[PDB]
Enzyme design. Structure first.
Site, PDB file in Angstrom:
ATOM      1  N   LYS A 168     -10.252   5.346   9.954  1.00 20.73           N
ATOM      2  CA  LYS A 168     -10.602   5.093   8.780  1.00 20.73           C
ATOM      3  C   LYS A 168     -10.660   3.471   8.411  1.00 20.73           C
ATOM      4  O   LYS A 168      -9.624   2.900   8.839  1.00 20.73           O
ATOM      5  CB  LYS A 168     -10.679   5.967   7.547  1.00 20.73           C
ATOM      6  CG  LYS A 168      -8.899   6.177   7.476  1.00 20.73           C
ATOM      7  CD  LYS A 168      -8.562   7.221   6.418  1.00 20.73           C
ATOM      8  CE  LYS A 168      -7.170   7.259   6.109  1.00 20.73           C
ATOM      9  NZ  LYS A 168      -6.613   8.105   4.997  1.00 20.73           N
ATOM     10  N   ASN A 192      -7.017   2.163   7.638  1.00 23.13           N
ATOM     11  CA  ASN A 192      -6.121   2.264   8.637  1.00 23.13           C
ATOM     12  C   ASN A 192      -6.397   1.153   9.860  1.00 23.13           C
ATOM     13  O   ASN A 192      -5.732   1.284  10.705  1.00 23.13           O
ATOM     14  CB  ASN A 192      -6.053   3.606   9.409  1.00 23.13           C
ATOM     15  CG  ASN A 192      -5.462   4.853   8.600  1.00 23.13           C
ATOM     16  OD1 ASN A 192      -4.669   4.284   7.470  1.00 23.13           O
ATOM     17  ND2 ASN A 192      -5.468   5.824   8.995  1.00 23.13           N
ATOM     18  N   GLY A 201       0.803  -1.208  -0.053  1.00 22.21           N
ATOM     19  CA  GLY A 201      -0.118  -0.079   0.127  1.00 22.21           C
ATOM     20  C   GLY A 201       0.789   1.281   0.131  1.00 22.21           C
ATOM     21  O   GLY A 201       1.972   1.113   0.234  1.00 22.21           O
ATOM     22  N   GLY A 231       2.003   8.288   3.296  1.00 20.16           N
ATOM     23  CA  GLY A 231       1.914   9.651   3.020  1.00 20.16           C
ATOM     24  C   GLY A 231       3.365  10.118   2.602  1.00 20.16           C
ATOM     25  O   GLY A 231       3.276  10.994   1.890  1.00 20.16           O
ATOM     26  N   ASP A 241      -7.408   9.964  13.071  1.00 20.31           N
ATOM     27  CA  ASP A 241      -7.225   9.539  11.490  1.00 20.31           C
ATOM     28  C   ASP A 241      -8.197   7.993  11.275  1.00 20.31           C
ATOM     29  O   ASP A 241      -7.520   7.254  10.544  1.00 20.31           O
ATOM     30  CB  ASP A 241      -5.762   9.271  11.086  1.00 20.31           C
ATOM     31  CG  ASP A 241      -5.891   9.273   9.529  1.00 20.31           C
ATOM     32  OD1 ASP A 241      -7.048   9.565   8.773  1.00 20.31           O
ATOM     33  OD2 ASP A 241      -4.741   9.025   8.902  1.00 20.31           O
TER      34      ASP A 241
END
Ligand SMILES: NC(=O)c1cn([C@@H]2O[C@H](CO)[C@@H](O)[C@H]2O)c2ncnc(N)c12
Ligand SMILES: [K+]
Length: 540
Positions: A311, A314, A191, A194, A309
């Site tokens: 979601k 994650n 994946g 950032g 964060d």
């Protein structure tokens, strides 16, 4: 079918499974060869002589101290009791009574077969009176505390004088060895992050599987994120939780910084929601996952640290079906008495307080737990469609103004926990008040979830990933970065690189040795419990 997609996964799956040499290097016995004890005099001086660290928390040191205790029968009996108290601490809640009696009659009697003589008669009697009163798994806590108070004395000082502590110093000399790119072998990208991309990697000597979160130096500089990277690393190390990804290495490269992390071969939850059948999954799966997510959030909030964060992408699944939280880069440790204020997060998952540049505490996380439970049940974000190309300015507008909509998929309990966690006022939001997560753990939603057996690992996950499946998009479908330009690195960045790059983490590294059986196979002393040549100081 694209070949690169196929080869990428057939390789990963081969390394994942195993199987000659267990996936180790051909010369692993030479790489992890013990030094001569004469090489450990520096370690001898710097090591802190703590019973709890050297004989319990540090994995290899806990086994080396038990090996020393088992050299003398007077000490082995204690190790037996402690092991027996552990079973009782995880035995059936109904069979506690009989097993608690087995221990009492096996260890804590005047002429018990393995009598422990330092527990104290008053203590056993107090413990023997409560035996009847009612049987709880904490019943024996004090008895073991008396054994540890005795073992931290003369036994610990004799261990430190033994060959087993010399062996520990050797193991520690190996632990502190430098880490580098040649320590690992990289596999496919799992994946995109950032500052870089997460890959699957393998320690070449032990064969242990991990995930490398690469953070490209040029990218960190272009986006002013040097404090986000360091925060993530420092966070990951500070935290301890079975429901959060754990850090094992952290090394530097000519062009990037790396975080070696727990590998989650089950995949991320966004994949299990949208790329595996119908949108969303059953409430039972959602129940279990939401429960463990909550547990992980309780572990984080103990250190007064927010996540901000939460979601689906994650949250990850492991070999067995349990989950962990992954990208802690946005997390921060609020001052124990102060609050924070920063518009950070991912659209559709930012709580109202974080959306009006208000000031907040550990609150936006319980909003994120509700956003997840909704998305897992329905199959979409509460305030956005699956593939709705809505300008995020409007997405904001909705979360603060409109109210989420539920359907026949939601049960009464599922709709309430969501509607309470999705309360647009932090004060009146479930968990955001005073009790803490404990107010969530009671909610009718979790009316069948025993958060104790959950936090203990007694409940079996609902869904179990298949080893010969890669629960992830294909490599060629993972998004890619745009080449950074004009951010030429210089010297002032070298100070942060050295602070980030701290090498291996002690306890994870030792566990890696135990798991891969490297410790088992190389931790051999001499015949009839004799000094081996690498520990003998009369000759090398
Ligand atoms: N902890 C992490 O940083 C991880 C990120 N990914 C993948 O990388 C993506 C990045 O969002 C996720 O959706 C996962 O597919 C991971 N995959 C496996 N194990 C991990 N520890 C991670
Ligand atoms: K699904």
């Amino acid at each position: 079918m694209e070949l690169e997609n196929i080869v990428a996964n057939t390789v990963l799956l081969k390394a994942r499974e195993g199987g000659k040499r267990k996936g180790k290097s051909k010369k692993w016995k030479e790489i992890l060869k013990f030094p001569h004890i004469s090489q450990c005099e520096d370690l001898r001086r710097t090591i802190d002589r703590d019973y709890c660290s050297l004989c319990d928390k540090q994995p290899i040191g806990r086994l080396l101290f038990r090996q020393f205790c088992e050299t003398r029968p007077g000490l082995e009996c204690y190790i037996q009791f402690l092991d027996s108290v552990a079973e009782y601490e995880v035995t059936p809640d109904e069979k506690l009574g009989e097993k608690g009696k087995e221990i009492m009659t096996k260890y804590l009697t005047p002429k018990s077969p393995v009598f422990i003589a330092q527990v104290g008669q008053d203590l056993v009697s107090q413990t023997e009176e409560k035996l009847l009163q009612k049987p709880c798994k904490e019943l024996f806590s004090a008895c073991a505390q008396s054994v540890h108070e005795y073992l931290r004395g003369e036994p610990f000082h004799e261990y430190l004088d033994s060959m087993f502590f010399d062996r520990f110093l050797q193991w520690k000399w190996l632990e502190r060895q430098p880490v580098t790119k040649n320590t690992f072998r990289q596999y496919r990208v799992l994946g995109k992050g950032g500052f870089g991309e997460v890959c699957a990697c393998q320690v070449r000597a032990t064969g242990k599987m991990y995930a490398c979160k690469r953070l490209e130096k040029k990218r960190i500089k272009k986006r002013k994120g040097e404090s986000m990277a360091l925060n993530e690393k420092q966070i990951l190390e500070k935290v301890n939780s079975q429901f959060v990804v754990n850090l094992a290495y952290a090394y530097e490269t000519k062009d990037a910084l790396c975080l070696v992390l727990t590998i989650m071969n089950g995949g991320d939850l966004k994949f299990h929601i949208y790329n595996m059948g119908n949108p969303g999954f059953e409430e039972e799966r959602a129940l279990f996952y939401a429960a463990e997510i909550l547990c992980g959030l309780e572990d984080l909030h103990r250190e007064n640290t927010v996540y901000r964060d939460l979601k689906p992408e994650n949250i990850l699944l492991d070999d067995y079906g349990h989950i962990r939280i992954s990208d802690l880069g946005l997390a921060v440790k609020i001052p124990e008495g102060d609050l924070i204020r920063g518009r950070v997060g991912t659209v559709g998952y930012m709580a109202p307080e974080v959306l009006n540049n208000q000031r907040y505490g550990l609150s936006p996380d319980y909003w994120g737990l509700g956003c997840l439970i909704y998305e897992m049940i329905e199959g979409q974000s509460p305030f956005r469609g699956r593939k709705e190309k809505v300008k995020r300015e409007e997405v904001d507008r909705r979360v603060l103004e409109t109210e989420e909509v539920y359907s026949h998929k939601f049960s009464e309990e599922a709709k309430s926990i969501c509607k309470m966690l999705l309360t647009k006022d932090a004060k009146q939001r479930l968990g955001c008040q005073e009790e803490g997560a404990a107010e969530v753990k009671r909610h009718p939603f979790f009316r069948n979830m025993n958060f104790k057996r959950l936090e203990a690992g007694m409940l079996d996950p609902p869904f179990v990933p298949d080893p010969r499946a890669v629960y992830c998009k294909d490599v060629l479908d993972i998004e890619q970065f745009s080449t950074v330009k004009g951010v030429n690195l210089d010297h002032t960045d070298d100070d942060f690189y050295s602070k980030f790059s701290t090498g291996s983490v002690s306890i994870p590294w030792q566990n890696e040795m135990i798991e891969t059986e490297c410790f088992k196979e190389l931790n051999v002393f001499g015949p009839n419990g004799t000094l081996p040549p690498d520990l003998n100081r009369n000759h090398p």
